[PDB]
């Protein structure tokens, strides 16, 4: 019964403070997340969840547990992630940034899921309590290969491919009671522009314009700033409006490097830059590709343009059902109908991506959003989130 | 054409020996490590710019290019590195080996299509994307068994493509005797784990009692056995389901059992477990399947726990006809018919199409071949098949 | 006992419809070879019940485990399965005797199969156990203050150390208090006292 889980929950202030604050203080940055996993574990064993480490890496993996159902209803997943970028309770707040992105919201539904349980909530569907590794946008590249520089290959896709299958899903993060249901993709391209000849420093030809330097780092400027322009640009033509939100996506150079800094006597032949570029759903990245080709051969500039990373956005397709029980359990205890997010929250990496490519309508909602949550919006997610599976794992599929 | 056509005669020797030491490179699942080596130190000497791309530093996938003009559409193509654990060796104008069979004989196939499209200098506005890769056998991790020793697909093309060896269509060579396929099958597998007990002590174990009602879980998974059998001798007809690129008939398949440990075997088990392979059209969500599983466990009335451990989705190609027709126009001329159909096996199966059709690059399956050789003039012509395809796609606008 | 089957298929090729008992899988033969060797145990014990001084003996079977492929490759379905069990004998009974039980059930179903022993352990009957038995009764009889009781047939048809000393021709009981979650203080004292005083009988005869 509803009324039941509520008060059950209003019980838990203190447990969910807890959880919050524990979870918080462990340190756990893209690459060093198992001590969190081992935490969300051993909470999900002690509360009855049967989790499993599902994982590529022993010391980097998904939790996965169930809240089972007495069979015929839909399932429902909550999600977040382990991975961040201390934590402390004072006056009805709790501070941290790994609590903001993302343990608070984490906490949530861990709390939800408790409350459920204990209630003895009629649930006909299962509730899977999915908590996952390497979220954050870190990928390897050249020399940075393997175990440390790994991420979203091996979370929320990795642990879904390997059971943590649902009919709906709901990942939580700190959208400010905001639903989103489309994301952006990407695709990252390595630069490297092409110059030379190389010269021992006090035989190097002066002067020579910078589209013409044999130095690659001086004609780099030239290009840094034609790109820039493309940028400027690209967001607007490819702005696009979904159901689930508006896309607006960006381009950042995120790095730079040419020659060495310990061998600096001869300036450098080459140099790379690497871009991050947002995709909406619709963008094939060699379309991008070309582009940026394009961007090249209008300076007469000679170019390696290299891909190291794709990966596709999703609108959620027949979120319908997921979205009224949320709406409906938000409006009972928000007390307002849900707001529409602004178009970053919508043109963002979101563990939606993954879910939605298997054939999973997901969307992503959560308390919070920047320095604290107020416990008072947390216990009200995790009202909604306790609502939204006892309506929804009740419904047949 | 007729230059690369003899210039690809005159490569027979090369695509003999590519294929030979190639398919005696012991390479299972879990240790392809050596047969990348082979595949990217090959690709270096032919100048095609290989990188190791991989989540391992001995299980990994070589991505290389033979670069265009500018102006095409780009066509990766497609092998995988891992084999199933016999030997490799030339013979009467054959080549011997199951590792030749699958899948070392296509790869080479395409290595030296690439040599030739390269080496005659064939004008190609688009790229040709060289993508050889690990763990597409359908091995997975489970339960204890974790980690690099027992991954396979999600480190092999999906890692690849995502992480830079993409493409605007791509073909995968398999041993389909020259019939093309771009419908595969999906998969979920289950760990289905029957609930019994008390377990007793050997001298204590009641009985009689009848074997849906024994305190062994064994003796209850004897039973739900028998009702997995007969529903997924109905499950294959129901999910029967045929697409452009082929007819999918999803088949069923408990691939092991383990209940109670052998040595500790005075304490009958109040736990059994079974693992079902269990195959999906591209259209059948994997808890529609649960459910009927969990459904058969109810009827017998029986409590048990329907887990699954894997989920992929399969796909047809969207998109796929520019590729389907360069591949059918080549074949014609090369071959002298057209092209016959697949059987449904082969379009409900796992192929690395799904990986790229999934990521948005229309890919479909085609090679010579198909279990204990290959014909060499067969390979020949496959070779050409490729390289004509290439010439036709990589010079159509994108 | 390992019943032969295949040939195995990747699973796409899998033919059906087939008859359990013809079934390439032999995860699905052995389905119908448990069931059998089931309805052969039910039978077994009561066959094979025997009356000793000792005890009466009730031999039971069970079986202990399965296992059949290996769970990270089940996209090919095995030739082999495996199961392990648990026979109990009388004191009287040649396992071989056994052995050939189940290879006849097997053979009765039509199946091929290894049945292979990896344990032989003879039981006893004590020989010549009455000093130890009367020096016991007679502790027990002070102590306690009843005469003994006779056990149950489970702990009769079990593995005690007995079997090791009456191997060895040393003349062996078992005994002591409790029996499932506690002892009481006042059963383990009694059965000290009980243990001391036989000690003091039984290591005062001449032998």
């Not at 918080?24 to 989790?51: C, H, K, L, Q």
């Not at 010391?59 to 992630?81: C, E, I, K, M």
């Not at 450098?268 to 090249?296: F, G, H, K």
Request: net charge negative.
């Amino acid at each position: 019964d509803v009324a039941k889980v509520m008060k059950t929950l209003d019980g838990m202030r203190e447990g969910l403070i807890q959880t919050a604050v524990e979870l918080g203080s462990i340190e756990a940055p893209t690459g060093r997340e198992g001590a969190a996993g081992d935490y969300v574990y051993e909470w999900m064993a002690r509360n009855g969840f049967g989790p499993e480490r599902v994982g590529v890496f022993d010391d980097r993996f998904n939790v996965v547990g169930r809240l089972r159902g007495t069979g015929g209803g839909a399932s429902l997943s909550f999600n977040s992630h382990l991975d961040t970028i201390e934590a402390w309770h004072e006056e009805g707040r709790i501070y941290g940034y790994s609590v903001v992105n993302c343990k608070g919201p984490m906490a949530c539904w861990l709390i939800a899921a408790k409350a459920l349980k204990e209630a003895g909530a009629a649930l006909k569907g299962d509730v899977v309590l999915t908590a996952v590794c390497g979220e954050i946008d870190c990928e390897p590249v050249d020399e940075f290969q393997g175990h440390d520089y790994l991420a979203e290959d091996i979370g929320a896709r990795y642990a879904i491919s390997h059971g943590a299958i649902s009919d709906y899903a709901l990942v939580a993060e700190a959208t400010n009671f905001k639903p989103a249901w489309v994301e952006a993709g990407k695709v990252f391209l390595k630069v490297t522009v092409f110059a030379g000849p190389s010269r021992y420093t006090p035989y190097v030809p002066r002067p020579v314009a910078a589209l013409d330097s044999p130095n690659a780092i001086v004609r780099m400027a030239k290009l840094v700033e034609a790109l820039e322009e493309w940028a400027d640009n690209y967001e607007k033509r490819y702005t696009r409006e979904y159901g689930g939100g508006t896309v607006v996506p960006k381009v950042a150079i995120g790095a730079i490097r040419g020659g060495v800094p310990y061998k600096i006597y001869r300036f450098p032949e080459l140099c790379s830059i690497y871009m991050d570029i947002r995709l909406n759903p619709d963008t094939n990245p060699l379309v991008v590709q070309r582009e940026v080709e394009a961007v090249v051969s209008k300076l007469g500039l000679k170019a390696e343009v290299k891909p190291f990373l794709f990966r596709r956005g999703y609108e959620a397709q027949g979120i319908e059902p997921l979205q009224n029980a949320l709406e409906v359990a938000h409006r009972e205890v928000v007390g307002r109908p849900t707001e529409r997010p602004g178009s970053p929250e919508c043109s963002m990496w979101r563990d939606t991506n993954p879910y939605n490519e298997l054939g999973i309508p997901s969307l992503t909602y959560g308390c919070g959003g920047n320095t604290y949550f107020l416990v008072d919006d947390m216990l009200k997610a995790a009202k909604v989130y306790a609502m939204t599976a006892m309506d929804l794992c009740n419904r047949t599929p």
